[PDB]
Amino acid sequence: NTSCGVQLRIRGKVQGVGFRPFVWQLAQQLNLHGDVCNDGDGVEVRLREDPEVFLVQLYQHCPPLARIDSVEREPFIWSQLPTEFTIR
Amino acid sequence: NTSCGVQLRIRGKVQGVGFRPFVWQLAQQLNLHGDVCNDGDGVEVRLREDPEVFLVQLYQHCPPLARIDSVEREPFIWSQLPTEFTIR
Amino acid sequence: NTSCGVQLRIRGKVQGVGFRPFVWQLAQQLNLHGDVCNDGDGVEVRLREDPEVFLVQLYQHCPPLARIDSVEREPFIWSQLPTEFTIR
Amino acid sequence: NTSCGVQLRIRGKVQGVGFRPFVWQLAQQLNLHGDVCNDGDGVEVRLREDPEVFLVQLYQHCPPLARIDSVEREPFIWSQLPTEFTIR
Amino acid sequence: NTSCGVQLRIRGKVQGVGFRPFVWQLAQQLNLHGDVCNDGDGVEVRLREDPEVFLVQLYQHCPPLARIDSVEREPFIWSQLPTEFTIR
Amino acid sequence: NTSCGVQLRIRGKVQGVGFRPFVWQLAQQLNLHGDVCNDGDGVEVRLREDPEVFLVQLYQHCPPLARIDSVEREPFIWSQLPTEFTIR
Numbered sequence: 001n002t003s004c005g006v007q008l009r010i011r012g013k014v015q016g017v018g019f020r021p022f023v024w025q026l027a028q029q030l031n032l033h034g035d036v037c038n039d040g041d042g043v044e045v046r047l048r049e050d051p052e053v054f055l056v057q058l059y060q061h062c063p064p065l066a067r068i069d070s071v072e073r074e075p076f077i078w079s080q081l082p083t084e085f086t087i088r
Numbered sequence: 089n090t091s092c093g094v095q096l097r098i099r100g101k102v103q104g105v106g107f108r109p110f111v112w113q114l115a116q117q118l119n120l121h122g123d124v125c126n127d128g129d130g131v132e133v134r135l136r137e138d139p140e141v142f143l144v145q146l147y148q149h150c151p152p153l154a155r156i157d158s159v160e161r162e163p164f165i166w167s168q169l170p171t172e173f174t175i176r
Numbered sequence: 177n178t179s180c181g182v183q184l185r186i187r188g189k190v191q192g193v194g195f196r197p198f199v200w201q202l203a204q205q206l207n208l209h210g211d212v213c214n215d216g217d218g219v220e221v222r223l224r225e226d227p228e229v230f231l232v233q234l235y236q237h238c239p240p241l242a243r244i245d246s247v248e249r250e251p252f253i254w255s256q257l258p259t260e261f262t263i264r
Numbered sequence: 265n266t267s268c269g270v271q272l273r274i275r276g277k278v279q280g281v282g283f284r285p286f287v288w289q290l291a292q293q294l295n296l297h298g299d300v301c302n303d304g305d306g307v308e309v310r311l312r313e314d315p316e317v318f319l320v321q322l323y324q325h326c327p328p329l330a331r332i333d334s335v336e337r338e339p340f341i342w343s344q345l346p347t348e349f350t351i352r
Numbered sequence: 353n354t355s356c357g358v359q360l361r362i363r364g365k366v367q368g369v370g371f372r373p374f375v376w377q378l379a380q381q382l383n384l385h386g387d388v389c390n391d392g393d394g395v396e397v398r399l400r401e402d403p404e405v406f407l408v409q410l411y412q413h414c415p416p417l418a419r420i421d422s423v424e425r426e427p428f429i430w431s432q433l434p435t436e437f438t439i440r
Numbered sequence: 441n442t443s444c445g446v447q448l449r450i451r452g453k454v455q456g457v458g459f460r461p462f463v464w465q466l467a468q469q470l471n472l473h474g475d476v477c478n479d480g481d482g483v484e485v486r487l488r489e490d491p492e493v494f495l496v497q498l499y500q501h502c503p504p505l506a507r508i509d510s511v512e513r514e515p516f517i518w519s520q521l522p523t524e525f526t527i528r
């Protein structure tokens with residue numbers, strides 16, 4: 001059933017730069033579950049877990065071709081909890 | 089804007105027994121925000137804060153005429169955060 | 177990879193009484209993941225999530241033939257996170 | 265330096281009944297730090313850690329001569345964090 | 353009544369630079385409550401909520417004329433919880 | 441007894457640069473407990489408390505001769521909780 005999650009919206013130079021793979025790899029390292037996608041208004045990252053370490057490291061380790069201009073966060077409800085972290 | 093909340097659904101003998109006032113008073117004592125209502129399928133309590141102490145004390149201090157048969161919890165998203173605890 | 181979990185050790189009259197199914201059903205209602213077993217020194221419940229609501233309700237809704245004499249908790253590390261709640 | 269703590273005020277039949285030792289033993293089992301005292305308006309328990317499991321078990325395992333009528337909680341600031349749990 | 357809060361003390365080039373408005377805007381984006389002021393030893397930010405995302409973004413998005421040299425955090429107790437985020 | 445902790449593994453130019461003292465001083469400022477060591481594969485920091493603010497500030501305030509290339513985190517269990525923060 002449902003659980004509280006977090007959606008992060010990351011905007012900047014975040015496409016064509018290895019950003020979705022970067023997010024994926026960071027989520028793997030952090031043992032996070034959810035997904036990442038590029039929906040045309042930046043990159044959306046949905047997580048089951050608290051996003052703080054992820055956010056710290058998103059910024060600090062941003063790929064060299066990428067550039068993060070802003071990150072927004074909001075809560076949402078998972079309909080079913082994720083068991084993996086996937087690129088969608 | 090939005091925040092993660094918790095909805096509790098309390099079923100049993102929970103109407104005509106001072107249950108909504110009891111919930112209100114417990115929320116006041118605990119400095120909780122949200123609301124309580126009876127919507128015909130028990131009592132729904134919506135909280136901004138984590139419900140655990142509230143739940144402990146709901147059970148332990150249940151009014152004498154009342155009887156709690158079950159409590160369910162689920163997350164939801166507040167559209168605007170509550171600044172009081174109110175009976176609705 | 178690994179995550180912080182909680183092991184609960186529940187002792188009393190907790191076998192032959194529907195206790196493992198009771199735990200399972202409570203974990204389902206609470207959307208918890210991990211497992212339950214009877215290993216000869218009571219019932220061990222391992223959870224991914226914080227156990228507090230589970231504990232409240234374990235006590236309050238204890239099956240009628242069962243009797244809980246004590247519950248102990250300790251942290252441990254999951255080797256892989258659970259995706260279900262199962263009876264083992 | 266300072267940290268956020270919780271003070272619990274437990275009222276009822278809570279003196280002459282083994283209540284301070286009971287609290288101590290529960291805190292030991294739960295690996296909690298802080299202190300307990302009887303200051304003439306019930307028993308005050310100060311904890312470094314979140315009090316929820318403690319509270320659950322305070323109620324469920326209340327000594328037979330004791331009787332808990334109410335428990336109140338409030339936050340406070342530790343001037344120095346406790347390294348033990350002690351009866352004061 | 354009272355709740356646990358966090359006070360952040362931000363020092364550097366943090367006056368005459370749009371820092372209080374920057375903090376305000378960040379708190380709005382994050383749905384945080386409390387206040388900000390310049391009391392002559394940097395900027396003090398008092399929050400109801402956990403400060404971690406705020407801190408991440410304080411640093412990453414520091415206005416161009418500003419410069420953050422240090423940030424300290426300590427807990428404190430709110431006398432009444434804030435319902436807005438305001439510049440004081 | 442045991443508690444959930446966090447181990448951080450910090451790699452880069454992190455030896456001969458005042459890194460262990462830097463970590464120590466940051467832990468003191470943050471009122472953290474645990475330890476730091478250099479075990480030949482970077483710097484390991486073990487903490488009792490949640491590491492997020494520590495991590496934010498590790499990166500932002502990295503000493504000038506140092507360079508942080510990566511930070512990994514994993515949970516572990518303390519055998520006895522630390523009462524100080526020490527360089528080992």
Ligand SMILES: [Cl-]
Pocket residue numbers: 014015016019020037038043
């Ligand atoms: Cl992308």
Ligand SMILES: [Cl-]
Pocket residue numbers: 102103104107108125126131
């Ligand atoms: Cl009602």
Ligand SMILES: [Cl-]
Pocket residue numbers: 190191192195196213214219
């Ligand atoms: Cl069993």
Ligand SMILES: [Cl-]
Pocket residue numbers: 278279280283284301302307
């Ligand atoms: Cl006493």
Ligand SMILES: [Cl-]
Pocket residue numbers: 366367368371372389390395
């Ligand atoms: Cl200012």
Ligand SMILES: [Cl-]
Pocket residue numbers: 454455456459460477478483
């Ligand atoms: Cl080193």
